[PDB]
Amino acid sequence: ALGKLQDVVNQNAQALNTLVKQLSSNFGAISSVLNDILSRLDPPEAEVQIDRLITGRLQSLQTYVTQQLIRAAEIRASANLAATKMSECVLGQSKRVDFCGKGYHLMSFPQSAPHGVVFLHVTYVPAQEKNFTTAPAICHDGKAHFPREGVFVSNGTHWFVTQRNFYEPQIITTDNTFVSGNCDVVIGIVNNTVYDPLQPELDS
Amino acid sequence: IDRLITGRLQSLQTYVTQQLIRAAEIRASANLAATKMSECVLGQSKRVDFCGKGYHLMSFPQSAPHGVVFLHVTYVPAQEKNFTTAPAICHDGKAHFPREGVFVSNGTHWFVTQRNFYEPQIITTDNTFVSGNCDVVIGIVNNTVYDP
Amino acid sequence: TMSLGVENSVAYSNNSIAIPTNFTISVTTEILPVSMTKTSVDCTMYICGDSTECSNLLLQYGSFCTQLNRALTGIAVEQDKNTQEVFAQVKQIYKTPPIKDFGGFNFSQILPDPSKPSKRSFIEDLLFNKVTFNGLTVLPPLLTDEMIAQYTSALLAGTITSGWTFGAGAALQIPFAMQMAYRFNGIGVTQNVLYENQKLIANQFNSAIGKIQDSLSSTAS
Amino acid sequence: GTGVLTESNKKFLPFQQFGRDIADTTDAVRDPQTLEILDITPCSFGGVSVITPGTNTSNQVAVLYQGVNCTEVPVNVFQTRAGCLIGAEHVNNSYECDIPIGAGICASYQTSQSIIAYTMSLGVENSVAYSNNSIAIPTNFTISVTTEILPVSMTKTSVDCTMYICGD
Amino acid sequence: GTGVLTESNKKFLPFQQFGRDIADTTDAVRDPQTLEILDITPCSFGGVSV
Ligand SMILES: *[C@@H]1O[C@H](CO)[C@@H](O[C@@H]2O[C@H](CO)[C@@H](O)[C@H](O)[C@H]2NC(C)=O)[C@H](O)[C@H]1NC(C)=O
Ligand SMILES: *[C@@H]1O[C@H](CO)[C@@H](O[C@@H]2O[C@H](CO)[C@@H](O)[C@H](O)[C@H]2NC(C)=O)[C@H](O)[C@H]1NC(C)=O
Ligand SMILES: *[C@@H]1O[C@H](CO)[C@@H](O[C@@H]2O[C@H](CO)[C@@H](O)[C@H](O)[C@H]2NC(C)=O)[C@H](O)[C@H]1NC(C)=O
Ligand SMILES: *[C@@H]1O[C@H](CO)[C@@H](O[C@@H]2O[C@H](CO)[C@@H](O)[C@H](O)[C@H]2NC(C)=O)[C@H](O)[C@H]1NC(C)=O
Ligand SMILES: *[C@@H]1O[C@H](CO)[C@@H](O[C@@H]2O[C@H](CO)[C@@H](O)[C@H](O)[C@H]2NC(C)=O)[C@H](O)[C@H]1NC(C)=O
Ligand SMILES: *[C@@H]1O[C@H](CO)[C@@H](O[C@@H]2O[C@H](CO)[C@@H](O)[C@H](O)[C@H]2NC(C)=O)[C@H](O)[C@H]1NC(C)=O
Ligand SMILES: *[C@@H]1O[C@H](CO)[C@@H](O[C@@H]2O[C@H](CO)[C@@H](O)[C@H](O)[C@H]2NC(C)=O)[C@H](O)[C@H]1NC(C)=O
Ligand SMILES: *[C@@H]1O[C@H](CO)[C@@H](O)[C@H](O)[C@H]1NC(C)=O
Ligand SMILES: *[C@@H]1O[C@H](CO)[C@@H](O)[C@H](O)[C@H]1NC(C)=O
Ligand SMILES: *[C@@H]1O[C@H](CO)[C@@H](O)[C@H](O)[C@H]1NC(C)=O
Ligand SMILES: *[C@@H]1O[C@H](CO)[C@@H](O)[C@H](O)[C@H]1NC(C)=O
Ligand SMILES: *[C@@H]1O[C@H](CO)[C@@H](O)[C@H](O)[C@H]1NC(C)=O
Ligand SMILES: *[C@@H]1O[C@H](CO)[C@@H](O)[C@H](O)[C@H]1NC(C)=O
Ligand SMILES: *[C@@H]1O[C@H](CO)[C@@H](O)[C@H](O)[C@H]1NC(C)=O
Ligand SMILES: *[C@@H]1O[C@H](CO)[C@@H](O)[C@H](O)[C@H]1NC(C)=O
Ligand SMILES: *[C@@H]1O[C@H](CO)[C@@H](O)[C@H](O)[C@H]1NC(C)=O
């Protein structure tokens, strides 16, 4: 799991090793050691090979620095992403999908790690699905009723208005539903009694 | 051969560096496309102009050679009418504010309508909530709030 | 001197609000590059193609070959990872039912086409049609066009038949009409609007899909 | 040059002796003695990779020659678009991808056990029981604590250019 | 080379003279006259900031 961090480390380490190993290359020079060339050749002769050694080592340094800049840009992108998740997943609750883990995001907890961060994303995942018959609206007195917050479902005979993310059926009352238009327009609308809380109170 | 090898190695290094930079750009685009898949396709996005100009309704992915094409289906309001708006309303000396919507007037009558679509409704205590007296709100108007 | 756009003074007054009395269901298109061609370059063959003396001379340059090859291999693995991240966001490959009753909405132009040997949608066919050995080798992608088409078809089927639910966990079936009602509730427009203008919205959506088809077919820019 | 000479259908002009391409490499030639055109194809070459389950698991490995037909190899041979895979037993059954070879082919070490290459499976098919009047609502939930590991910083390395290039 | 020589606990084999590392730089040596092992450490150096 920690590969993302470990990988990074290795990469950097690998580069350094390569860089150091580039000190043991001839690049066309008689030897890979400056001291040996200086001790075995006069300056007029030595400088010819030392030029090749210097050019090779400078080119290796430039390659290392270029790849380090590219990798640092990659790590800066990842660090901006980590700061975004800290701001939005940790310091708040992210409504964005799959930004702070699969499932609905409840919270997140940061945890340091060597040259990196680790977010424990506590998410809410619905588990047990039940089939139901659903209708977009309901007709009581010719007026189509739509649910304020929730959905109309049926266990076969009775109609309930339950929130969408958790099956908690409730009686269909005017508190749960609001009317808009008649029932000659909607498709899939059904008939059902819409209980009125005020009716029994007025009765007594 | 020394010169040839030096030149060709320089060419290869230049190619690989250009490829690394271009691949970083393509990976930024790929992360953006993964985000759009997660948040526009797998869900409905509140972020503005992220999933198309308008109010995002949905998105549909379509593979294309070395890329993804998102069809963003969005809701764009079309025909706008002017109205006179009052921040609140006074019926019994108590200011009334719309729970979810806005007060508009077609010249004589006052309605409370959802903000992004004209569905006027008769103002009632269910459409509005009271807060304080009627000597603070600026622009408040006089009207009657129907009591069911 | 270029103009920045038509001057448009907003008729602002401290008590005047403009409310929209209608809407359009606009289908726009956004194309995003995801991966670049996976290419691997053989250092020795390119620099010293079939030359023992040249290879010996090149051996003195240390670990240039290993680092170049590692860079290209990392780029190729990155392309595979990009495609996997972008498309393989669906755990199970959902498929739309044979009965296409989506509340009047017509997805025949984007759902997979059994007729073609590759299960690729019509607009996907349009997109594919519009878009077009010296030690350099072009490695093939891990996910073929067929597999990416399967992933996109799974995403479309899950979306159509289950709303956003399939992104959170187990995919829950739901009528597309009610799905669109929820989408409308998301943007701050009550759901009764969708139910009362379902036929109009379906016609607008189908016309927008047709316009997308025509735009892709005609203009290749 | 070095290459494979094959009979060609190209319509060389009478005065032309060679045929080049965008690379300017010799793509065709004309036999000086008998005036017949020959297409030149690059001698087959390509990377050689090794599909190996962890040595801790097994020492048996398969060898992939990338992008080479299964005819140019010296000598349990599978010809996929990725290349020629030697040491992998082709299996019609499809499982999840384990060691991605490419072109939709992934190789896994499985049941005596050997390395089997197969068209990788894109997860489990699941037909949603969709209908215009059916909604599935979840009756329960689970609080899942997942992990997301992000690099934030890397080693701060400085290099003494003078000392490195010209140490003392 | 240039560096600081320190008494070492490395167990050089009788025939081995130098001690290299991943850097391929001489980490240890065997004093040719007195058969003892000496660790070689690069002379201290570093950036000078203000
Ligand atoms: C659908 O749900 C309703 C309400 O829970 C069920 O009706 C009740 O059923 C219980 C027994 O399960 C009885 O004790 C109650 O008296 C019933 N109340 C009413 C108002 O009917 C109904 O049986 C359920 N139907 C199905 C098919 O599950
Ligand atoms: C819901 O109830 C209404 C009335 O309560 C039904 O309307 C009836 O429809 C039939 C056939 O179309 C007519 O013959 C009746 O005259 C209608 N009644 C009234 C009062 O107009 C409607 O059909 C019912 N819908 C369902 C699905 O049961
Ligand atoms: C503003 O809206 C109100 C209510 O929608 C309109 O009042 C109606 O006017 C018509 C005129 O033909 C009458 O038949 C109705 O009886 C009135 N309804 C009520 C409840 O009074 C009013 O005309 C509209 N005025 C403008 C300028 O738009
Ligand atoms: C709303 O109604 C109230 C009372 O019905 C108005 O307040 C009156 O204003 C007049 C003139 O300013 C005074 O002479 C009365 O004494 C006030 N009475 C009360 C009870 O406040 C108020 O002006 C009305 N608002 C508008 C915008 O017309
Ligand atoms: C969805 O749209 C397609 C075309 O955009 C419709 O296919 C057409 O169906 C009619 C049926 O009378 C044929 O005459 C046309 O030739 C078809 N066109 C194409 C391009 O195939 C399809 O019928 C639509 N589906 C729904 C449910 O409306
Ligand atoms: C909202 O705008 C749509 C157009 O986007 C209107 O629908 C058109 O209505 C005209 C005549 O009313 C018809 O000729 C067109 O065929 C309709 N187009 C479509 C796509 O259905 C709609 O009537 C408008 N509604 C309101 C209330 O303004
Ligand atoms: C919802 O699911 C949880 C488990 O995720 C259920 O809790 C388990 O219930 C069984 C039987 O009562 C016990 O044996 C387990 O130990 C419980 N698990 C935990 C973690 O406490 C719970 O009963 C389910 N609720 C409903 C209404 O289905
Ligand atoms: C809903 O009914 C269909 C009918 O074929 C069934 O396949 C499906 O499993 C049911 N839903 C659940 C959650 O069991
Ligand atoms: C669902 O579709 C069937 C036919 O496929 C139709 O008979 C029925 O009336 C439809 N019901 C709803 C609510 O859409
Ligand atoms: C609203 O009033 C402004 C004021 O000039 C006018 O320009 C505009 O056309 C009006 N709105 C409509 C829909 O006509
Ligand atoms: C709006 O501006 C006009 C100026 O023409 C002013 O008379 C009026 O009082 C203002 N309304 C409010 C609520 O401030
Ligand atoms: C030379 O080659 C041509 C090509 O066909 C042939 O006709 C001719 O007889 C040859 N002459 C000799 C001397 O080989
Ligand atoms: C080999 O792998 C298995 C699991 O894959 C592990 O349990 C075992 O410890 C490993 N052996 C060694 C020597 O690492
Ligand atoms: C390999 O060569 C044979 C005969 O030359 C040919 O039939 C086959 O199609 C070739 N393989 C590929 C993948 O082209
Ligand atoms: C795999 O199935 C195909 C046809 O479905 C058949 O021709 C082939 O022989 C099978 N391969 C094996 C190894 O059984
Ligand atoms: C040479 O060095 C060895 C190392 O201890 C020593 O034993 C020997 O006496 C030395 N010989 C002379 C001539 O100094």
Side-chain angles (χ1 to χ4, degrees), chain B residues 39-137:
Chain B
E39 305 174 6
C40 314
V41 182
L42 265 59
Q44 198 193 7
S45 195
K46 284 284 179 58
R47 302 171 61 178
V48 179
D49 295 13
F50 185 65
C51 313
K53 175 171 167 61
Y55 303 106
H56 180 245
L57 291 179
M58 54 191 167
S59 276
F60 303 112
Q62 301 286 249
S63 69
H66 291 348
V68 65
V69 183
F70 296 99
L71 318 185
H72 302 301
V73 190
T74 66
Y75 169 103
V76 180
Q79 308 172 12
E80 52 275 16
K81 294 187 180 182
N82 296 341
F83 299 98
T84 297
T85 171
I89 276 187
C90 296
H91 177 45
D92 307 329
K94 310 185 299 305
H96 295 61
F97 309 76
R99 291 182 183 174
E100 306 176 357
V102 60
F103 284 129
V104 294
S105 169
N106 75 334
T108 58
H109 308 63
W110 281 92
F111 303 107
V112 50
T113 166
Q114 40 169 319
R115 319 213 292 265
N116 296 274
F117 188 70
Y118 188 63
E119 196 200 47
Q121 304 177 329
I122 299 289
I123 302 172
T124 84
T125 57
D126 293 335
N127 307 344
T128 71
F129 70 89
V130 294
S131 307
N133 69 84
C134 278
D135 300 330
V136 189
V137 184

Side-chain angles (χ1 to χ4, degrees), chain C residues 154-215:
Chain C
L155 290 170
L156 266 119
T159 306
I160 296 164
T161 57
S162 56
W164 49 59
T165 67
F166 87 99
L172 308 168
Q173 63 263 31
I174 189 179
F176 189 87
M178 303 195 67
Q179 181 190 146
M180 282 294 299
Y182 299 1
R183 305 294 190 157
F184 270 57
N185 276 127
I187 71 193
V189 181
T190 44
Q191 56 209 329
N192 58 270
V193 168
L194 177 281
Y195 299 134
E196 294 175 2
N197 311 330
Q198 188 171 325
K199 296 175 187 175
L200 165 60
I201 290 165
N203 296 341
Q204 291 183 356
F205 170 91
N206 305 340
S207 297
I209 292 285
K211 292 175 188 174
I212 288 299
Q213 288 184 311
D214 300 357
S215 174

Side-chain angles (χ1 to χ4, degrees), chain A residues 45-88:
Chain A
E45 307 173 354
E47 288 184 5
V48 183
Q49 312 297 358
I50 299 171
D51 295 324
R52 299 170 196 167
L53 275 184
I54 287 173
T55 301
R57 286 181 176 178
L58 187 60
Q59 177 176 347
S60 168
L61 252 177
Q62 290 178 1
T63 296
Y64 169 86
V65 172
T66 291
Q67 288 192 2
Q68 285 295 129
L69 285 169
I70 291 169
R71 185 175 305 100
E74 180 182 4
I75 292 293
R76 183 184 59 247
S78 191
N80 294 319
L81 178 60
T84 308
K85 287 182 187 283
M86 191 76 66
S87 297
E88 305 178 4

Side-chain angles (χ1 to χ4, degrees), chain A residues 155-158 160:
Chain A
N155 67 336
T157 63
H158 300 55
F160 309 114

